[PDB]
Design an enzyme around this catalytic site. Structure first.
Site, mmCIF file in Angstrom:
data_model
loop_
_atom_site.group_PDB
_atom_site.id
_atom_site.type_symbol
_atom_site.label_atom_id
_atom_site.label_comp_id
_atom_site.label_asym_id
_atom_site.label_seq_id
_atom_site.Cartn_x
_atom_site.Cartn_y
_atom_site.Cartn_z
ATOM 1 N N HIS B 365 0.747 -1.262 0.000
ATOM 2 C CA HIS B 365 0.000 0.000 0.000
ATOM 3 C C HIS B 365 0.779 1.316 0.000
ATOM 4 O O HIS B 365 0.165 2.379 -0.040
ATOM 5 C CB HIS B 365 -0.950 0.030 1.201
ATOM 6 C CG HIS B 365 -1.968 -1.058 1.193
ATOM 7 N ND1 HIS B 365 -3.196 -0.927 0.587
ATOM 8 C CD2 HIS B 365 -1.921 -2.322 1.685
ATOM 9 C CE1 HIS B 365 -3.868 -2.058 0.704
ATOM 10 N NE2 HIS B 365 -3.116 -2.922 1.366
ATOM 11 N N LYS B 556 -8.896 13.861 4.196
ATOM 12 C CA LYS B 556 -8.062 12.657 4.283
ATOM 13 C C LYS B 556 -7.159 12.801 5.517
ATOM 14 O O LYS B 556 -7.171 13.843 6.172
ATOM 15 C CB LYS B 556 -7.218 12.499 3.015
ATOM 16 C CG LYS B 556 -6.232 13.630 2.759
ATOM 17 C CD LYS B 556 -6.585 14.367 1.480
ATOM 18 C CE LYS B 556 -5.941 13.707 0.275
ATOM 19 N NZ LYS B 556 -6.802 12.675 -0.376
ATOM 20 N N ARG B 557 -6.386 11.774 5.853
ATOM 21 C CA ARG B 557 -5.523 11.895 7.021
ATOM 22 C C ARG B 557 -4.538 13.044 6.797
ATOM 23 O O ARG B 557 -4.173 13.326 5.655
ATOM 24 C CB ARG B 557 -4.782 10.581 7.289
ATOM 25 C CG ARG B 557 -5.672 9.482 7.883
ATOM 26 C CD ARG B 557 -6.229 9.861 9.255
ATOM 27 N NE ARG B 557 -5.174 9.991 10.261
ATOM 28 C CZ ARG B 557 -4.842 9.047 11.140
ATOM 29 N NH1 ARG B 557 -5.473 7.882 11.153
ATOM 30 N NH2 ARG B 557 -3.868 9.267 12.012
ATOM 31 N N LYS B 562 0.536 14.489 1.698
ATOM 32 C CA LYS B 562 -0.781 14.792 1.116
ATOM 33 C C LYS B 562 -0.852 16.289 0.803
ATOM 34 O O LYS B 562 -1.730 16.751 0.065
ATOM 35 C CB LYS B 562 -1.908 14.393 2.073
ATOM 36 C CG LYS B 562 -1.779 12.990 2.635
ATOM 37 C CD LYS B 562 -2.743 12.028 1.977
ATOM 38 C CE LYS B 562 -3.175 10.917 2.941
ATOM 39 N NZ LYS B 562 -3.518 9.647 2.213
ATOM 40 N N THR B 664 -8.563 6.592 -2.480
ATOM 41 C CA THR B 664 -9.899 6.110 -2.798
ATOM 42 C C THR B 664 -10.916 7.217 -2.603
ATOM 43 O O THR B 664 -12.005 7.192 -3.186
ATOM 44 C CB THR B 664 -10.250 4.879 -1.952
ATOM 45 O OG1 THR B 664 -9.864 5.106 -0.590
ATOM 46 C CG2 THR B 664 -9.502 3.645 -2.498
ATOM 47 N N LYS B 668 -14.401 8.441 -4.614
ATOM 48 C CA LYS B 668 -15.708 8.721 -4.028
ATOM 49 C C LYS B 668 -16.257 10.047 -4.562
ATOM 50 O O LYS B 668 -17.445 10.164 -4.860
ATOM 51 C CB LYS B 668 -15.627 8.764 -2.503
ATOM 52 C CG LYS B 668 -15.323 7.426 -1.865
ATOM 53 C CD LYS B 668 -14.830 7.626 -0.440
ATOM 54 C CE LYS B 668 -13.954 6.471 0.045
ATOM 55 N NZ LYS B 668 -13.684 6.836 1.444
HETATM 56 O O1 LIG Z 1 -4.782 0.874 -0.774
HETATM 57 C C1 LIG Z 1 -5.662 1.602 0.073
HETATM 58 C C2 LIG Z 1 -5.001 2.865 0.521
HETATM 59 O O2 LIG Z 1 -3.908 2.502 1.424
HETATM 60 C C3 LIG Z 1 -3.216 3.655 1.996
HETATM 61 O O3 LIG Z 1 -4.068 4.420 2.875
HETATM 62 C C4 LIG Z 1 -2.560 4.525 0.848
HETATM 63 O O4 LIG Z 1 -1.958 5.675 1.380
HETATM 64 C C5 LIG Z 1 -3.650 4.936 -0.209
HETATM 65 O O5 LIG Z 1 -3.073 5.588 -1.312
HETATM 66 C C6 LIG Z 1 -4.442 3.701 -0.717
HETATM 67 O O6 LIG Z 1 -5.507 4.098 -1.557
HETATM 68 O O1 LIG Z 2 -6.224 10.066 1.329
HETATM 69 P P1 LIG Z 2 -6.580 9.127 0.154
HETATM 70 O O2 LIG Z 2 -6.568 7.707 0.571
HETATM 71 O O3 LIG Z 2 -7.874 9.526 -0.502
#
Ligand SMILES: OC[C@H]1O[C@H](O)[C@H](O)[C@@H](O)[C@@H]1O
Ligand SMILES: O=[P-]([O-])[O-]
Ligand SMILES: O=c1[nH]cnc2c1ncn2[C@@H]1O[C@H](COP(=O)(O)O)[C@@H](O)[C@H]1O
Ligand SMILES: O=c1[nH]cnc2c1ncn2[C@@H]1O[C@H](COP(=O)(O)O)[C@@H](O)[C@H]1O
Ligand SMILES: OC[C@H]1O[C@H](O)[C@H](O)[C@@H](O)[C@@H]1O
Ligand SMILES: O=[P-]([O-])[O-]
Lengths: 830, 830
Positions: B365, B556-557, B562, B664, B668
């Site tokens: 990831h 997001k976090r 980021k 992700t 959304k």
């Molecule tokens: O794979 C699921 C997610 O894992 C982590 O949170 C990564 O930072 C993100 O980019 C990815 O979409």
């Molecule tokens: O912060 P990213 O997983 O949308």
């Protein structure tokens, strides 16, 4: 099948579909993977369904009518299993039995799966449970308030003859009976300091712990009344227990919540012994603080929280509230009630005190010094600063009352002080309870007199009107109808069922004392009971016993004052006599001794090892054969008690005269067909007085004889010198006859018996074995033994907790009992 | 009302009586004292009832047919609320809405009472949740396995602009969805030592902790499939955690049980960051050990636990089992699977290894070094002695494979080692997963290429067949139908409902891109969504916003990669331009930034303070008026995401190219009508590629530009020197313009930006604001903006987790998805 109620057509069908509903929807299982545990839960949920309707209307009722409320505060509630007892009080036993049978299941096998609610140590905790049942049965608006320990009294395991303690994880699989009520969580404070500002003192900078309540239903006997037992659980706030910032760790902060929550983690396993640990004091204030907020909230609504004189006048508080202190454990309720009224509601001291004295009542359970609660002031000073101040102020004004009554009596002043000077200053919680309560009672006539003559003499002289007596009792539902249906049926065949809630009617059984059929029947159920117990023994513990022998049982907590040791001496005597004249006839006996020893009580644990040690020798002597077996009953608890008592022939209540406050096990045996061999101690006196001393096996010193001996000075050597049989036994223990590999194993017992026996075991030895010979003689005459049994049973009515509760109600609480059926359970949804 | 299903006559009546049953029998309340929380529970229980029937047949089905089982191991499962989602997948939403309405209740008001299941940090945890939903919807026999933390991700509170963390007590009121299964408790071992005796090694003298499972149902979309999510809870044994005798204290022993139970107490709040704490490693082995025993037990039954070749031949293990490793957190499953097969089942190493490699697959990831798990050997040595040995042996044989492939390449050998030498020896968990898995995948095309080109280059050269890609996705049920019914309805009005489980069909929406009615509608739901969010804002957080402005949101976090900081720079730029020419027109904007910072991440917490600091200045400048508001979205979590995303106009996905694995949240936003401004990073590339770069706002450096800059060397002073607007902003932060009382408050941010910016914020500044001007220009043209929106929505089909799961299934697991409705839920009781 018995009078366990009607097995109606419509209701058995209804039960079955509900059993299946729960197995599917609630347990989420399918008949193909369901185990007996799942089946037990399906039944429990089904049974629980029948009393929620009643539970809701009962509480709604008390809200409408608004009667005087009885609050029973206790740190112990020795409940046991609740499935059968619920079936019994709802007249559901036969219907459920039928239904589960048709479902192809054995109800009895499922009942054994339910874990005991062991939130108690012994006598005191079980009394609270029996009281709850009677208060519901007598239709009183009463509430049981305590702590929901996630670990109850430890499970006892015997390894190599020694007791091993292991955590009682009774909630492991869940508790279908309780209902968590997170919406009524209350805050409780600890530590902090006291600020004296302009208009009053302020308890400030405190640590907050939350008290979350859990309600368990308490059903009355067939009257549609379901009262509540509210048990508090400790929870950490999510703020300060994380929010007090500036380094330490976020993870650690969350893990540290289990520090405030440890308050309700485990029950202290001490019976008639005081341990001044901080965790204990915290549990004590915890149940008190949360309960009082709940009591006041309910009062603030009543009918005053509508109109009445209009002005929160607490003058009527005593007319609507009654709080009973089960021992001094909840004693902080007194200064806490004062704290709220004075510090928060702003009443003047004297008005507040009048209210507090008028609503609080205290029950004393023992006279031994080591069982008395004397809390070091430095502990109270740090943990509850404002309560210590209140206590000092209470002491000040109380002592002024004394000095005014007994001018110049300077020694009386120090003797009565709530504050004890010395090594470390302590607070005498009992003196606190006497001063802040309008009634103080003993639990048996002789114990109550002893309180007036000895321990609380000065207090009695000051306010004689406060001291009363309320002889203990047991509930005939669990202790007769539940554990001994066979006996309850034959009694009912002759005198009806009304005696279940009116035990006095058992007297009518006196006219059947010469009835041939009854004698045959009484004797038959006892034989059936002994056979079932003898079987359970091999089933669950494994190693045979003879059901034709006399069942000699002594079951209670292991104590030096209960004298299991005296029992041991008799057992060894019987052994030695048999070895002397092997081919001489003696009445066979199975002597069963069971009970738990507090983990830190070394002597008690040494006694359990002696018992098992005797059995190792006795049970394997070929010459003895089946004439004598010594068995130690493992993990004695409520559910085990329901099994042994109905199967006992001889009940052993042999404490040193003046040490056992009352006792209740003795009453359980009397009502179930056992004859009693004991001393004129506690309730034994009243039992013998009720059945007639001729139908009782009394022996040993009376209280006066004990005192005479103390004036003189107790010297055990004297008894050792003049009794050869006794001497032989002591030299047997001393030489390793019972401990070959470790010859000096029992040196502490011998040493104690000879030099520091506070309970003069030797002094009663001769009269005890002499008296034991007399019961053996009578057991040889089945017809006369049984006729004496009928004399005891027929005369045990006075020892029902229904009689005890009716007296507390009238003479202390000021409420009238009522055997009126609440208006059915019938649906309803407003 | 919408296509939330049918509000049938028979079913609405049925729902209502069941609602009342539960309120009475389950919650034990009466309409007169019931609060909204009680009402929510009555509904939840009623809804839960509808899927237990399906749950039981689904599992019974898999037992009969015995298909290949998919086990998804993850330490995180970011579930959120489950009431609405269950209603949605069961087609119960309208019926429940109707029923509760007739009962006089607002369903929406009750839904807000359910606590979020925050057992996740961010992207990784939410992916697991979306995957679960898709696996059920595609009818795969899959099981989610994790830890049931009693405290999830912390609740974030903003005090004086700073983030305050507070324990997330999500179980406080109970969890109606889970089903405790104490009967399947399993033992897990820790510490101990390894004995090498005659026929094999033995892990001995271990500390035992029990793993108790809890099952939560996972319903597929309208197909009657209900899979299981099994979450383990830590429990102390009642023996040794008490029985290891010889002084210490009985009370303390019981209190000390909360040491073994701390293993499942709280989730580590780290997102893309590795903390080598012992508690974490314990949680990792805990979920792994318990899960594998469960997997093997299920396999031992299958059809082999009947006949088959007869001889527990694990050769078919890979044909019946597939375990997916969500990151390296469950990496111990590899050496643990080896331990069982070798040490317990006694298979030869090579046969065991073949089986293990064939059943395990790993998903990576991230590429940032600080997120990589490298466990110190001394930790593994003490806690899991036998696993370290197995790991050393795995390394030995793996490296021999390397040396044989690349003779003489001595540096490659050390680079690929699972064991890292240096300060302290560590174990590279990722190297472990690559070696013991038959498939390694990235979560987006570019991330997957980067893994092959950079980080795992050596491994790719060794076994190219192992590396795959599986672009992430989101579930259209929760992320469209649930959070945005308005949009789902208008789409359905035109193309039907089949797209909910076949998102690709959204392409048909392309033919309505010039449809006047649709454009009006798409624009209308977005306006309705913004109005509802603007209201929620004042309702629950209080202080107005303008719904006519552009909703610029970045949620997001909080991370340095980021670049919320880059967003901040733009916000301050807009402010400064307005103050320069006040009476000049600019498109109004509400920029919302939300996200949680790990408690120990100082920089992240400093950024949250900057954001709020900017809002303090901007939101109170009279000259600015309603043209610009800066709001920080408190406690961003799943349920909050369902609210903001449907109301967003602009989605901010501005991470430095090459740092965001996939993301992700971006998907959304695209599916809910927001336009995206971002860099060619992660899935942004595939999204732009799907919608067309003309309908996307791409800016900044591409991965190659970043690398060029690194060769050269990044010097932020250069950008500071040539851009006056940027210079003005930095001098504003440096002088206390945003922090009057504490002028040097933001020195760490400025210092970092100028001297240690690992993510070159400045390098993308010019192109970012230039690009932001272009979206403002397009927003001024409502019709064209909306037409571009339709182009994005209509082209988001590829980002459904159903497409992702179908690929995992076919290309990794070896199973075929099926959209076949399971044979109804229909009663049945065998
Ligand atoms: O794979 C699921 C997610 O894992 C982590 O949170 C990564 O930072 C993100 O980019 C990815 O979409
Ligand atoms: O912060 P990213 O997983 O949308
Ligand atoms: O304010 C009130 N209105 C109506 N009924 C109430 C109210 N307070 C208590 N009750 C009823 O009284 C029962 C007793 O509640 P408690 O004694 O305060 O726990 C409740 O379950 C309700 O039936
Ligand atoms: O031995 C068995 N006999 C019959 N049914 C079983 C058996 N083992 C599992 N099942 C069914 O399969 C479901 C799956 O159980 P699990 O996967 O082992 O948790 C169970 O709830 C039962 O319906
Ligand atoms: O009052 C209930 C019981 O309390 C204690 O356990 C006393 O030792 C006992 O004699 C009494 O019967
Ligand atoms: O309370 P007693 O029977 O030991």
């Amino acid at each position: 099948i018995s009078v366990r109620g009607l097995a109606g057509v419509e209701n058995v069908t209804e039960l079955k579909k509900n059993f299946n509903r729960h197995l599917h929807f609630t347990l989420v299982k399918d008949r193909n993977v369901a185990t007996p545990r799942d089946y037990y839960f399906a039944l429990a949920h089904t049974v629980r369904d029948h009393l929620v309707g009643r539970w809701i209307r009962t509480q709604q009722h008390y809200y409408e009518k608004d009667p005087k409320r009885i609050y029973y505060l206790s740190l112990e509630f020795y409940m046991g299993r609740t499935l059968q007892n619920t079936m019994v009080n709802l007249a559901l036993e036969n219907a459920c039995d039928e239904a589960t049978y048709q479902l192809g299941l054995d109800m009895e096998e499922l009942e054994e799966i339910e874990e005991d609610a062991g939130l108690g140590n012994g006598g005191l905790g079980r009394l609270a449970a029996c009281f709850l049942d009677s208060m519901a049965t007598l239709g009183l608006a009463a509430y049981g308030y305590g702590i929901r320990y996630e670990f109850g009294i430890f499970n006892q395991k015997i390894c190599g003859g020694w007791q091993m303690e292991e955590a009682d994880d009774w909630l492991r699989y869940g508790n279908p009976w309780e209902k968590a009520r997170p919406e009524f969580t209350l805050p409780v404070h600890f530590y902090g300091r006291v600020e004296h500002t302009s208009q009053g003192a302020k308890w400030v900078d405190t640590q907050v712990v939350l008290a979350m309540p859990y309600d368990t239903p308490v059903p009355g006997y067939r009257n549609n009344v379901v009262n509540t037992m509210r048990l508090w659980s400790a929870k950490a706030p999510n703020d300060f227990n994380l929010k007090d910032f500036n380094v330490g760790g976020y993870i650690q902060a969350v893990l540290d919540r289990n520090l405030a929550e440890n308050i309700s983690r485990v029950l202290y396993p001490n019976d008639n012994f005081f341990e001044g640990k901080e965790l204990r004091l915290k549990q004590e204030y915890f149940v008190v603080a949360a309960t009082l907020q709940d009591i006041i909230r309910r009062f603030k609504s009543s009918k005053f929280g509508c109109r009445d004189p209009v002005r929160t006048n607490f003058d009527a508080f005593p007319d609507k509230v009654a709080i009973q202190l089960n021992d001094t454990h909840p004693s902080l309720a007194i200064p806490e009630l004062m704290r709220v009224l004075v510090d928060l509601e702003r009443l003047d001291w004297d008005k507040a005190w009048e209210v507090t004295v008028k609503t609080c009542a205290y029950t004393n359970h023992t006279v031994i010094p080591e069982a008395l609660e004397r809390w070091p002031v430095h502990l109270l000073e740090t943990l509850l600063p404002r309560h210590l101040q209140i206590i000092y102020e209470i002491n000040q004004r109380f002592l002024n009352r004394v000095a005014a009554a007994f001018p110049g009596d300077v020694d009386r002043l120090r003797r009565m002080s709530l504050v004890e000077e010395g090594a470390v200053k302590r607070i005498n919680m009992a003196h606190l309870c006497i001063a802040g309560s309008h009634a103080v009672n003993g639990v048996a006539r002789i114990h109550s007199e002893i309180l007036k003559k000895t321990i609380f003499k000065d207090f009695y002289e000051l306010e004689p009107h406060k001291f009363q007596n309320k002889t203990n009792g047991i509930t005939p539902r669990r202790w007769l109808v539940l554990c001994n249906p066979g006996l309850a049926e034959i009694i009912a065949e002759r005198i009806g069922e009304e005696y279940i809630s009116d035990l006095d009617q058992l007297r009518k059984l006196l006219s059947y004392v010469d009835d041939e059929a009854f004698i045959r029947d009484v004797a038959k159920v006892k034989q059936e009971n002994k056979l079932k117990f003898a079987a359970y023994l091999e089933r669950e513990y494994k190693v045979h016993i003879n059901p034709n022998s006399l069942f000699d049982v002594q079951v209670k907590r292991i104590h030096e004052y209960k004298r299991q040791l005296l029992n041991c001496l008799h057992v060894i005597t019987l052994y030695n006599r048999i070895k002397k004249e092997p081919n001489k006839f003696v009445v066979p006996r199975t002597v069963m001794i069971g009970g738990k020893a507090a983990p830190g009580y070394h002597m008690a644990k040494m006694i359990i090892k002696l018992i098992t040690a005797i059995g190792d020798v006795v049970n394997h002597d070929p010459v003895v054969g089946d004439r004598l077996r010594v068995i130690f009953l493992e993990n004695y608890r409520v559910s085990l008690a329901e099994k042994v008592i109905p199967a006992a022939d001889l009940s052993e209540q042999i404490s040193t005269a003046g040490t056992e406050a009352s006792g209740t096990g003795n009453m359980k045996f009397m009502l179930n067909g056992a004859l009693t061999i004991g001393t004129m101690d506690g309730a034994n006196v009243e039992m013998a007085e009720e059945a007639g001393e001729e139908n009782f096996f009394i022996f040993g010193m009376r209280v006066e004889d004990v005192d005479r001996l103390d004036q003189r000075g107790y010297n055990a050597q004297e008894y050792y010198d003049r009794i050869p049989e006794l001497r032989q036994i002591i030299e047997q223990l001393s030489s390793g006859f019972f401990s070959p590999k470790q010859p000096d194993l029992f040196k502490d017992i011998v040493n104690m018996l000879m030099h520091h026996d506070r309970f003069k075991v030797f002094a009663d030895y001769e009269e005890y074995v002499k008296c034991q010979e007399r019961v053996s003689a009578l057991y040889k005459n089945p017809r006369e033994w049984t006729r004496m049994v009928i004399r005891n049973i027929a005369t045990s009515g006075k020892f029902s907790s229904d009689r005890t509760i009716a007296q507390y109600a009238r003479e202390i609480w000021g409420v009238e009992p009522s055997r009126q059926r609440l208006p059915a359970p019938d649906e309803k949804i407003p």
